[PDB]
Amino acid sequence: GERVVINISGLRFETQLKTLCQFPETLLGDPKRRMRYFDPLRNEYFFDRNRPSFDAILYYYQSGGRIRRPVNVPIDIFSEEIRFYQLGEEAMEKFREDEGFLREEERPLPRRDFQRQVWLLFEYPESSGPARGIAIVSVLVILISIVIFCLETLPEFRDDPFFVVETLCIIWFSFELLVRFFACPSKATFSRNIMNLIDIVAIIPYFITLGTELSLAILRVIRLVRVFRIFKLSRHSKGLQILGQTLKASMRELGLLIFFLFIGVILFSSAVYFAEADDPTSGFSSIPDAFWWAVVTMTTVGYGDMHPVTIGGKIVGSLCAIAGVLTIALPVPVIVSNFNYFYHRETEGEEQSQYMHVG
Amino acid sequence: GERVVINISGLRFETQLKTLCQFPETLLGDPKRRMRYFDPLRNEYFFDRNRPSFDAILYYYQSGGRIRRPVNVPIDIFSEEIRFYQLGEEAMEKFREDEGFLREEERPLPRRDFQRQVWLLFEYPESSGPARGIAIVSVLVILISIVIFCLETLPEFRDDPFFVVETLCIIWFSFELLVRFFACPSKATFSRNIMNLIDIVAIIPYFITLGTELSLAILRVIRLVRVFRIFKLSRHSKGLQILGQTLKASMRELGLLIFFLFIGVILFSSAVYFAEADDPTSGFSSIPDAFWWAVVTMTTVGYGDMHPVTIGGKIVGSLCAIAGVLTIALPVPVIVSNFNYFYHRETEGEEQSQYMHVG
Amino acid sequence: GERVVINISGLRFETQLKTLCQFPETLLGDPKRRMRYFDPLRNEYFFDRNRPSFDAILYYYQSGGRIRRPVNVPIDIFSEEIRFYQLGEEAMEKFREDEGFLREEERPLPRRDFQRQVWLLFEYPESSGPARGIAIVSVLVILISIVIFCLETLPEFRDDPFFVVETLCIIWFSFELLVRFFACPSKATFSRNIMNLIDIVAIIPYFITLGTELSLAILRVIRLVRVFRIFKLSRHSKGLQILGQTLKASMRELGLLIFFLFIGVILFSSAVYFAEADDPTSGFSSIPDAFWWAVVTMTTVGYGDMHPVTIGGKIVGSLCAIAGVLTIALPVPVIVSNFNYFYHRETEGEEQSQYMHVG
Amino acid sequence: GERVVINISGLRFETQLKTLCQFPETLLGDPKRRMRYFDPLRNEYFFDRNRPSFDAILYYYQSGGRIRRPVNVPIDIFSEEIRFYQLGEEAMEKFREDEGFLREEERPLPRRDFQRQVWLLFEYPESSGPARGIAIVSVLVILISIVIFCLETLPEFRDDPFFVVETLCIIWFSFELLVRFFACPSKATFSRNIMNLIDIVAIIPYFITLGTELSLAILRVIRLVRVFRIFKLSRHSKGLQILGQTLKASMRELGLLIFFLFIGVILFSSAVYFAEADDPTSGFSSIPDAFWWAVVTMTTVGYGDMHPVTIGGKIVGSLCAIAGVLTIALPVPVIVSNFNYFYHRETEGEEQSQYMHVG
């Protein structure tokens, strides 16, 4: 009912007493903690603290829980004022998701001594010595395997000695498969994180080769999954994580690029067909034939096998070359801004934020 | 004449009384509403409200109606303060066009039960069940029709069976034509929204084929309007609306791109002509011939049929390749900023704004 | 010596009296103008004006003349407060060059009635009726002339009838030359504005043809100045003015682009020479020969006449293709930001600024 | 224990006295300097200074040394207030590294009269007359030498007269080598600055030619270091310094570009191999052969020697052309922002900052 006066180093704030009695745990809401800040000659509380920061602390009492931050006060100064006014760890955690820095995820443990030794030994290569030694050999097994796959597709050998070279890798592809299937917090959550479901498609398509030798169009595609062994490098590369979430945060913005271009692939190929169908020398036999000419011009690749020849086709091709810029440059800066939003918060993100946030 | 003191939680404001008597309907302007906020021991009115928000509410009384917003206070907080001070729905609507979020347009009704059932059934596919079922079939009729037009221009059949395939579509192009011509709020405003005038050019150029078979250069162009059937997909695509307004907001900024390039198409073709006219092997027969070489180089497409050969032409072509970047990259970022201005206010625009604006 | 208190609607400011006595013409500095704002019950001056705007007006008295503007207060509100406090037209003009909007240039007059009629008739086409009629015919004379120059270089006529076509233009190129040489504020300043010195190079190189027919390498270049007739279109085009100042504000930033690329033209051509000199089939005869290959790859034009063939040249050409992006994309966004700085202040610039600035 | 009141032109600040007694050298902390600002009728100190600037000066006393700056107050105004309040040269230097402008590096001297004359004569060409005359001749020695190296690789002379032309340069490459080796502050720090270690690789690879004439694959590469003579131009070019630090500040961001592309060079070449291996006419013999096709398409260079022919390869090449944009445009704007961060602070950087910072 009655009101209180709070004097933050010369700046006067006046709220009713019952507003501070919403949160009877904090500094301002507990009548025995603030009694050493009272000033009986002026009937007010004097804090020699930051001036522009208390305007946000007062709003947390009035709004009932919303923690904002003014532009002037930095992160390392506003975080101390939450610690000084004792707003609580629920109030402190609201400064996380307001700012954008997400909390750390607690990892489950296999509640033993054997499986708790080997879980932190391979999943967390920064733990121990051979944990750093298991990472420096896990980069080789994929890197040799992508090279011999590049070496198997060489025309010197295609036009079994390499079988002892590849089985040197797949048993190591089983060696990290076997020791990780059963050492996990739960087999359920081991089948959720996509970084290992993709790895078992490096052991199945080699295994289907053995059952088939001991349907020819299938035999090409089951060696095509041997190009997916380059996706295992995302385990030991921080950059592909940032590229990984960039597409993962732009499922829709990529589909708007493909749809925006595909109208022009229909439109300009049909426009150059109806201006170059009157020529026995013109290569444009069909609109299905002229689909390749469109996507090369709008991407400004410009091969030079296909050529418009009449004057009506060259003005069609001129407007196709201009509109390829505008049908590409519009959706893509939201993909650069999505990438930098993830690039910032991984290499320089939690080095200033969480250093003075959690405490 | 006399002045009043308003105390917004410790911050004192003092205006004359006649300034509050400009708007004798609101909270501060009505002498029986504010009488429960008076403080007879200090001769002032005490509000325990947001501090930096009242600086904008006070300016609305002084300026006579202008509603601004400080940078600090968000949209969801400044909107409550207009609701608390009871500034009025005309004052609340000024927070719309100041912020930029435009009001919703009221749609007219055909004041019946038959035509009011069928107006909301096809124009508003989110209304009912078969309203969502009429949209999933309206995407097929255009999509098959663009495919058979691509299939009619195949060279396997050109070098009537397809007539029963296309008339399967045009009667459906009449089926959405017929039921929408007469079910409308007014036939006048049905002929204003361009999304249906373009649709009737998918029934007229097929109809001119029938009168002509039952002038050869006209027969090509009346099949050229069968490429305009891809423009009907903007009815069931939110993305082409955003691309649609992007060109619609940059009629002038596109014409500055075409004019800026076209000076270089004249200039560099004339410069490479006067350095390569001294060669019987040079392909550059004319400045009308060298127009095609210019627009390919400045767009960095680079076909490779045309080749400058002398040393004087290669330095001309070098400056043509550099200046193609600067004659393209300058006008286009105002077209990316116009696109993102419409991209933001359609998918994430009214999800934070109007959720706490209208009330 | 003594101090004054100024109360801007509840906010108290206190300066010494001698600070207001620096500028004894304004409202606060003149002791008979502010005497109707005095408040003898509080010993202060009460203004019911804008609160955050007076913090900048007070700094103008303390600093001795510097007029700033806070971020919060707009242009149309801060301009009224200078008008209300009567700071003066010298103080008002300091709000121009602080904000960036330059003053209008006063044009000189030929102090007569004949020459003052004809000066505003052609230089200012927005003056009268035929002033708009002289602009619609001044666009034709250059546009026909650029076409017949394009038509003279046609190979149908080169491989005198066109002389009566071109002299139809050059006498009109004399008709705007003659009536503007002598109608001017001064013949001195008529020879300074570059928009007419360039026009007289459309009458001299045609005139040298007549003295020579009534040295063959000169005869080509004196028809090469007939491509400079496209530069006269900047008189009746607002866009080329903005492009004109963009290069005119980036003399240095263009030279940093040409120098940055030219290191790569030396470097990669020498690197591909030393990896492809071991081949009788390689086209790269010299580093002067491989200069053309470098500038085509780094600009991503990619003709396709020149081809690296050995494996050592393809890895050289791969790094040449990547580094062409970084040797182009770095200097150019300061040229887009210079263009938009001039694009904004010509079509939408003085429509909000000077509408409430000068008064 | 007791508190003081400071009145910055109407704005009241109140801190305890012991907070000002942390820094007993400044104006507020020294009880004989502030005694002429006291006001015995109000028991406070009155300063007629800038209002929003003292909120940052007060925080320097409370935080114990941190000097911030509000957004409102400029650099030339906040710097005067540090000078007026006498915060000290250690406090003044904290305004440097907070703002970002680094201090000037003191150069060592050879403590003589001979070597101190010649150190400032060549390293500092802005010192004297012939110091500007030694720079205008130091640009020629490298520029002729890069030309005769371009002239030695001409095919008119390769398919000794030029030896007296090149030794005219290398003795001048010794003339700036000899006079700078021994005139330095220390021979240790002369071997640290990379701008001269690179210069001595313009005298060693010519010297190995003399020992070998008075191993053929070495003879090519020791003339390949004669392309490194273009790197000496960074001594007399301010622009290459800014490009020099741009790569020097993006060692990691360049490696993320090469790694991001190289996944696509593996992926799409393997995808176009498995769709074009079924053709005797297809040029794609191997994935090592198709590596060149990938990096040309993703960079949108598009030579035109290699051509996908089947329909399955053209849809593979279409997605390769699109994804080349997204595998290039993502890392590069952090390299444009790193370049402009160095471009700003060298030509317009210390012209506003240090003009009113150091004093």
Side-chain angles (χ1 to χ4, degrees), chain B residues 6 8 13 15 19-20 23 26-28 47 49-70 73 77-87 91 95:
Chain B
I6 303 132
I8 307 293
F13 296 86
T15 63
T19 304
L20 309 183
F23 298 92
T26 68
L27 181 133
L28 301 188
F47 299 99
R49 304 293 292 145
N50 190 216
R51 263 170 77 123
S53 174
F54 196 74
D55 213 338
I57 311 295
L58 197 71
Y59 167 76
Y60 164 76
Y61 278 85
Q62 303 182 336
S63 46
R66 297 170 185 171
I67 297 194
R68 256 287 199 277
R69 178 183 75 97
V73 54
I77 302 310
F78 193 76
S79 40
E80 176 49 54
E81 302 293 304
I82 306 177
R83 255 174 275 149
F84 170 64
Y85 288 129
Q86 309 170 16
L87 294 189
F95 193 35

Side-chain angles (χ1 to χ4, degrees), chain A residues 3 12 59 62 252 293, chain B residues 39 48 51 77 239 303 343:
Chain A
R3 82 190 42 150
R12 313 247 170 175
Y59 167 77
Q62 303 182 336
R252 157 172 32 88
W293 180 86
Chain B
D39 205 350
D48 197 1
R51 263 170 77 123
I77 302 310
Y303 266 21
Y343 182 76

Side-chain angles (χ1 to χ4, degrees), chain D residues 75-102 108 110 112-115 117-131 133-151 153-157 161-165 167-168 170 172 177 183-189 191 194-196 198-199 201-211 216-219 221 225-228 230-231 233-234 236-304 306-326:
Chain D
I75 304 293
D76 39 313
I77 302 310
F78 193 76
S79 40
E80 177 49 54
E81 302 293 304
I82 306 177
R83 255 174 275 149
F84 170 64
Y85 288 129
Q86 309 170 16
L87 294 189
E89 72 280 71
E90 173 47 41
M92 176 51 99
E93 96 162 11
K94 254 177 285 187
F95 193 35
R96 292 187 251 275
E97 50 267 1
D98 166 76
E99 202 33 73
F101 301 98
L102 196 43
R112 268 171 292 277
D113 189 25
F114 207 108
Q115 306 191 351
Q117 163 78 47
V118 308
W119 170 254
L120 280 298
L121 169 57
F122 308 101
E123 288 313 288
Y124 290 77
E126 76 293 340
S127 90
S128 35
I134 206 57
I136 191 170
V137 65
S138 311
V139 63
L140 316 171
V141 56
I142 53 191
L143 172 142
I144 305 303
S145 76
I146 198 62
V147 157
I148 303 301
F149 171 69
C150 167
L151 264 289
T153 59
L154 211 53
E156 194 146 339
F157 320 121
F162 274 172
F163 190 74
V164 306
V165 193
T167 53
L168 187 155
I170 317 159
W172 197 273
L177 165 82
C184 46
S186 94
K187 315 274 303 300
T189 189
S191 91
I194 203 49
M195 289 201 103
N196 53 30
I198 61 184
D199 301 359
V201 197
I203 296 114
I204 181 173
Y206 161 71
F207 281 161
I208 305 308
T209 63
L210 274 299
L216 69 93
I218 299 112
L219 317 175
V221 315
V225 157
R226 296 174 44 192
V227 314
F228 284 76
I230 201 154
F231 288 106
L233 281 75
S234 56
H236 290 315
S237 90
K238 195 42 142 41
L240 212 161
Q241 305 309 301
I242 319 185
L243 184 56
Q245 309 182 198
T246 301
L247 289 89
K248 254 58 178 162
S250 311
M251 316 298 204
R252 157 172 32 88
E253 301 85 322
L254 284 199
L256 206 41
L257 161 70
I258 306 307
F259 178 69
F260 276 167
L261 69 90
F262 207 79
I263 302 182
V265 192
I266 303 311
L267 209 158
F268 285 125
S269 53
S270 41
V272 76
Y273 201 48
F274 292 152
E276 286 288 15
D278 55 303
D279 182 46
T281 89
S282 155
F284 309 124
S285 79
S286 85
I287 304 186
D289 170 50
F291 281 157
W292 172 252
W293 180 86
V295 73
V296 152
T297 302
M298 312 196 318
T299 39
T300 74
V301 174
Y303 265 22
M306 310 231 80
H307 297 277
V309 282
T310 207
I311 307 308
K314 297 191 174 182
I315 179 63
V316 158
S318 152
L319 200 71
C320 181
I322 296 309
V325 177
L326 312 172

Side-chain angles (χ1 to χ4, degrees), chain B residues 115 117-131 133-146:
Chain B
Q115 306 191 351
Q117 163 78 47
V118 308
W119 170 255
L120 280 299
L121 169 57
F122 308 101
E123 288 313 288
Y124 290 78
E126 76 293 340
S127 90
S128 35
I134 206 57
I136 191 170
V137 65
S138 310
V139 63
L140 316 171
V141 56
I142 53 191
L143 172 142
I144 305 303
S145 76
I146 198 62

Side-chain angles (χ1 to χ4, degrees), chain B residues 151 153-157 161-165 167-168 170 172 177 183-189:
Chain B
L151 264 289
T153 59
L154 211 53
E156 194 146 339
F157 320 121
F162 274 172
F163 190 74
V164 306
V165 193
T167 53
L168 187 155
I170 317 159
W172 197 273
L177 165 82
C184 46
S186 94
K187 315 274 303 300
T189 189

